[PDB]
Amino acid sequence: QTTKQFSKVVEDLYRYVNAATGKPAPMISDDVYNIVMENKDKLNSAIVYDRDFQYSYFGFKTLERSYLLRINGQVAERPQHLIMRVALGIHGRDIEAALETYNLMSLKYFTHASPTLFNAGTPKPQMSSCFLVAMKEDSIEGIYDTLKECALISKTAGGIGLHIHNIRSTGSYIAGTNGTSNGLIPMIRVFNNTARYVDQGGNKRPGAFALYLEPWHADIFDFIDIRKNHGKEEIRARDLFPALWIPDLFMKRVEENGTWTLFSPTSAPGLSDCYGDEFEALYTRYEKEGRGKTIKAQKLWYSILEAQTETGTPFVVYKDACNRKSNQKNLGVIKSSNLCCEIVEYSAPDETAVCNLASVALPAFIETSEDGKTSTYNFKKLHEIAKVVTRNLNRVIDRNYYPVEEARKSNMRHRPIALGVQGLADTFMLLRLPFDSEEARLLNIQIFETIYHASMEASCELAQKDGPYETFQGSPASQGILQFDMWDQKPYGMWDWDTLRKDIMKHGVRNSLTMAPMPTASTSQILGYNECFEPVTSNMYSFQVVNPYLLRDLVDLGIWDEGMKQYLITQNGSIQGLPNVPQELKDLYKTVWEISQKTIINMAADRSVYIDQSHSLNLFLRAPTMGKLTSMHFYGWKKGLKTGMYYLRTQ
Template identity: 65%
Template sequence: MSMYVVKRSGKSESVHFDKITSRVRKLCYGLDPKYVEPVVIAQKVIQGVYPGVTTVELDELAAQTAASFATQHPDYSILAARISVSNLHKMTNKLFSEVVTAFREYVHPKTGAPAPLISQEVYDVVMEHRDTLDAAVLHDRDFEFDYFGFKTLEKSYLLKLHGKIAERPQHMLMRVAVGIHLGDIPRVIETYNLLSEKYFTHATPTLFNAGTPNPQMSSCFLLCMKADSIEGIYDTLKDCAIISKYAGGIGLSISNIRASQSYIRGTNGTSNGIVPMLRVFNNTARYVDQGGGKRKGSIATYLEPWHADVFNFLDLRKNHGNEMERARDLFYALWIPDLFMQRVQGNGNWTLMCPNECPGLSDCWGEEFNELYERYEMEGKGRKTIKAQSLWFAILDSQVETGTPYMLFKDHCNRKSNQKNLGTIKSSNLCTEIVEYTAPDEIAVCNLASINLSKFATPASDYSGETGNFDLNKLKEISEVVTRNLNRVIDRNFYPVEAARKSNMRHRPIGIGVQGLADAFMILKIAFDSPEARQLNKDIFEAIYFGACNASCELAKDEEPYETYDGSPASQGILQYDMWDVTPSDRWDWAGLKERIAQHGMRNSLLLAPMPTASTAQILGNNESTEPFTSNLYNRRVLAGEFTVVNKHLLRELTSRGLWTSSVRNRIIADGGSIQNVPEIPKEIRAVYKTVWEISQRIILDMAAERGAYICQSQSLNVHMAEPNSSKMTSMHFHAWKKGLKTGT
């Protein structure tokens, strides 16, 4: 039976093994010929050929085959991406301006109505500067993505026409740059180049929506219940639904909602408490997904531990029990005052209260909270008095079973906030890195971007900890660019609800995070828990904070300070590290910066907020955020199937030393991705490639606190315990609290 292939033009021709080999070989430039063998890929592809197979299918098969060889050498992942990218390039228009025109002129095939995917404003800018922008797009940079990064873009990020991807990764990045800066072409080109060179990335909603008719570019929205009434609850629910529709993650404070059995004056009845209400929010999160099926709606609800319904709150995600008392699609967090931690530590009593009977507790913090809470206790207004530790152990049980509630420390969040002049901060967000003021008429918003730390590390030649280099000056410059960009995002953003626009324009908070901290340490050949890594961890965040403060001050000079700047700690010469009683290094001119801030102010109330970076780190090929690697070997699932992936830094190290043998590979697989029990691997390499399970979690918390002095919001933080028990978990939580962390674990 003769085998023939159908080309993209629709013509048929015979299948030629040599042609397949030649196509793969052309894409192997710069890859290690000792490991990457085009003939082997071609042989596997030929086995999957059938009469009438398309060239598109052949390319996909070749890419999947190359990806399946990635456990032999990381260059195979690069080759897999190149095949996929080359395939996309053959199916898409090259010129950015023509792609934008097609998006602008799109007509919905079923309704026949115009359905433009690009805003008029962005289209006009692109048409006016089409030659400049078309020339600036460097398509070869698409080949810099690894296979899993490219597949992530392909699945969710690149815009489609008629169900087919019509945008290349470089087009997307230019769309984002124009969407942010519009007619400021030098800034557009600067942003495009830094994005495409992978120095930083904007957050997922910005990549999704920049340049579109409804450019909702914000990641996080924080709300408090508008009122403890049917009107207040359902107004808040509607806001949550609208925000979810436009791909926003939500943090919601519910501490002011009356507890069950509380009196309702309007009907002379009693309240059912927070559980039935949260089931309604749960169903809304399920129904309203983010942007029509891209991501399920995400809502984290925050409750203070004095609330009388707290035990029911802890059960909401559990797998057993009465279904009418479960709401498993929400996430849960506790907003914990210091007083509760002190009572647990001293094995004291704890009084549960209803906010309807003991008002004002969620509106104050610190000594003011302590006095009010203890006054209600003395007056006998509480519902029930229990041992603080009985609630504590219920919290730990819930964490072991469900992973929630997250624990955030209310007093640390308020004490160390540059927004403390606005009022009491009542919650964080889904990922626990955003800490912003909310009010019934203000929905806090945060626009995010993350800096790729692996870009600033020059590889070390040995394991002494002294031969690599990390470019802190360049890092500071990138932080300044990101700060300017996020300010433009605030200005250009589409706000789903007016209360969000009002808040963002008044306070202008931004959230700069990082990804690839663990990758940077590996490039520098230093262990995650080494003194060198701990020092660099501090230096990195000091540089980012200095750059962000400097750029925010420059913007205030050119425009004006944010509206509520007066009365803030920054307006009194107090920056984040001052609130931690930390003295910064003398690398940067902090005294000069404070003088400039005193003169010009700041454009933003908040600047740093290291977020999880789950999707964008995959796009750029980094480990997430500030996290250590959880394993040196893991499975990645994409639409084409599941692939085994090996830590690329380790793989390069072992292949260069001739240590990547089948016996070593099998031993690592048997040990679940650990290399600590592989004697062939030198000790200094094993130290650098410890997984999170092999690093002291106390050190993880210490490093979070050490960089925390330069983080004016908070930080997403995971702690890993193979065999958690109440003693270990109590020790961990109290260590985080005593270290002054805003986000516990």
């Protein structure tokens, strides 16, 4: 019920015409069509259609539902065809690299983020997932230009993070009239409205932008409350996500139980265009000068926590930790993260930051291969594959179709890239390692060091062929200061950092950033592994499937029965305090709510030194409480995390 020969499938796709309209609607690009036809034999015979049986029933139905291209609502592309198309879309004329990417992706070593999977090798190749946008100016012209931009971006795949620190707060003065300003909320309501009007890619799910405000902005209280399902209606913005861009001085005032001061950006200019001490200097001076409204820090705090407890938002991202520890610091002051709090990239009115994403599948490197029946981890294959994905994401930068000029400007200047991971929890389980074990802690550090090292090396090789990126000179990287150096730490040492730093100083790197582990929400589901780097949330998930690693074990112990089936549904996928189940299994299959959030922050802190950018650290709290949240926020803060919190997931 789908044509088999690949080039025949391309033919159809490429020759498509929309019957309702009589318009030719080719779904393959010219340049990719040509490549395919010019190499039809090599390409056709390289595919291995058994590999379609690598996908779980749920894995495949995800692919089927919205990934594999359709001709008149009918799926016309086999999973292998999707992959082959992707590999071509990325690799163009370089058939060898294409062919390499094909095998590895089909073998499920890694995958590319959804935009790539959707649009690679199609005429409008928009393979980018992230856009961080700057509010252009505190004017009606600036506001509507940015609005126009978000709409144009939203037309295609990819989420937006938008920062709005420069917008005049409620009641602020306006030259030329006696009218006074209305603040962020009415304006937020405009963005929200545009988010709902512009389809993403052309389908069901709404626009969703994330909004970045620094907690001193005079409209903060309402801003943080944007997602509440009560109060009024016209004070909310229920399709957007508030994200706090928090400076240390705030955390400090909260801790010391002191005061916080709210400014309108026009009474207190420059607050967001600096960080660390210069910021505190400037902020304290403005406070002295009575340009704002002072209140007790802990009153803002307490509000911030109420919102997180109810909505899981705002997210928290530490402005200082982000700017102090960015390889982009030479470009200027970074003003926001993105929609999923993983990207940390400079943006300006004329530079909208972009990022391409792929995820290495960590389980694929477990080989129970030595002799007996221990497993090891093949960190050599991890390095190799990590290098390939680096090269891929880099190719994507050039072949990408940018939705707006400020995106193309930004990407061609700095070439940031984003690697991350899926199936950490799987690797751990397969390796008989409890998520909170000293062994798992070692493995985390190790996996991440090796990806960072790999991608930095592969990027170094690139710089050697195509020159460093335009803005390499002046970077921490160009001075020998890599990610972990900015954490005042020594790398674990599994790889040779001296030689790499040596080369990097000599030849540069092609990419300003490389690592930003992301949520993997849908691309982990295709491959059949757990979300990114978080532990399982349940052993039962939901049409209800028992954890295959758990299940396997329950059988070998001849204890899997009806009570064991139904207990898992009762106890929502938890095996703790369950009568006939060994301590080994109990430790290994703790749900995420059963692991200390201190351990999570620890391992997050551990891998963070090999992360160029940030990672989407979700927090999970079972029995939620002000004080409990407070110690999780501050704990992470002091660890020097960038993304202190993505969602607060609860119940």
